[PDB]
Amino acid sequence: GIDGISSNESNIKIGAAANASHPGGVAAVSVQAAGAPYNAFTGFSSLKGLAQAFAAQGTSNTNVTVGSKTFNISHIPVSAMPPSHSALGNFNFGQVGTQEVYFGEWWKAGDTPASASHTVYYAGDNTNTTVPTAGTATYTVAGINGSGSNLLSGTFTANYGAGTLEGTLTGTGTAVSSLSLDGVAFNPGTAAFAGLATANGTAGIDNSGVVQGQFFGANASALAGIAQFDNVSYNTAFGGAKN
Numbered sequence: 001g002i003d004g005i006s007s008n009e010s011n012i013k014i015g016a017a018a019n020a021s022h023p024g025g026v027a028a029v030s031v032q033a034a035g036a037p038y039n040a041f042t043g044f045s046s047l048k049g050l051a052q053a054f055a056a057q058g059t060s061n062t063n064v065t066v067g068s069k070t071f072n073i074s075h076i077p078v079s080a081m082p083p084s085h086s087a088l089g090n091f092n093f094g095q096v097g098t099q100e101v102y103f104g105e106w107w108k109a110g111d112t113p114a115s116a117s118h119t120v121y122y123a124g125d126n127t128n129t130t131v132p133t134a135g136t137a138t139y140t141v142a143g144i145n146g147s148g149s150n151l152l153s154g155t156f157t158a159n160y161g162a163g164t165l166e167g168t169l170t171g172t173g174t175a176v177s178s179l180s181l182d183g184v185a186f187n188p189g190t191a192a193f194a195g196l197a198t199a200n201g202t203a204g205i206d207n208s209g210v211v212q213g214q215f216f217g218a219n220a221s222a223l224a225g226i227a228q229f230d231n232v233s234y235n236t237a238f239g240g241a242k243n
C-alpha cells in the first residue's frame with residue numbers, strides 16, 4: 001500500500017520496507033545506485049531511528065515547525081554510516097507530522113546536491129486515503145532542496161471541486177528561493193496530481209519544472225510530491241499537512 005516515486009529510478013526507488021539489518025516501518029526507500037545487500041528497501045521510520053541514534057557521528061533528527069505544523073527532518077550523511085555503507089550516499093528527508101508520509105532527497109557520496117546524482121522522492125501509505133470531491137482546503141508545506149537544515153516553506157491551496165493545487169514554497173537558505181506550482185491538477189475525487197513548476201534561486205529563473213505527487217490519508221490530511229528541473233540543483237521534494 002505504499003505509493004511514491006523518485007526523479008531518477010537509476011538511483012532511488014520507493015516501495016515497501018524489506019531490510020533485515022534495519023527492519024521496521026512500511027514506506028521505504030531503496031538506493032538502486034548500490035549493489036545488494038545495500039539496495040534493500042529500508043523503511044523511512046527505520047532510517048529516522050538511525051538518524052536519531054547516530055547524531056554524534058554526523059546524522060541529525062530535528063522537529064521543524066512551519067506555522068502550526070511539525071515536520072520531522074532526518075539528515076544522514078555517508079560519513080556517519082559504517083565504511084561498508086559507502087555506496088549508500090547522502091539523505092535528507094522529512095516526515096509530515098506523525099503521518100506515514102515522507103519526502104526527501106539523495107545524492108551520491110562525493111557529490112553535492114548540484115551534482116547529476118541529486119535525486120528527489122516521496123512515499124506514503126495510501127491504505128485509507130480519501131479525497132474530498134468539493135470545497136477548498138489549504139496545506140502547510142515544507143520542501144527539501146539540498147539541505148537538511150534550511151527548508152522551503154509555503155501554503156498550497158487545493159480546490160477539490162476544480163481539481164487544482166496552487167501555491168509557492170519559499171526559503172532563504174537553499175538553491176531554490178521560490179518554487180511555484182503551474183497548472184498542477186488532479187481528477188476530482190482522485191489522489192494523484194501532476195503539472196509544471198517554475199523556480200527562482202541562485203541560478204535565476206527556471207521554467208523547466210515538472211511536478212508529480214499525491215494526497216494521502218483520510219480526507220486528504222496530507223500531500224507529498226516532487227518538482228524536478230533541467231537544473232538538478234533545483235530539484236525539490238515536498239510534504240504538506242492539511243490545515
Ligand code: HEM
Binds near residue numbers: 022037039054076082
Ligand atoms: C540507508 C540504507 C541502509 C542500508 C541498505 C543498510 C544496510 C546494512 C547492511 C546490509 C548491514 C549488514 C552488513 C554491514 O555491516 O555492512 C548493515 C549494518 C549496519 N548498519 Fe546499515 N544500512 C543503511 C543505513 C544505515 C545507517 C543510516 C546507519 C547509521 C548512521 C547504519 C548503521 C549500521 C550499523 C551500525 C550496522 C551494524 C554493523 C556495524 O556495526 O558496522 N546503517 N546495514
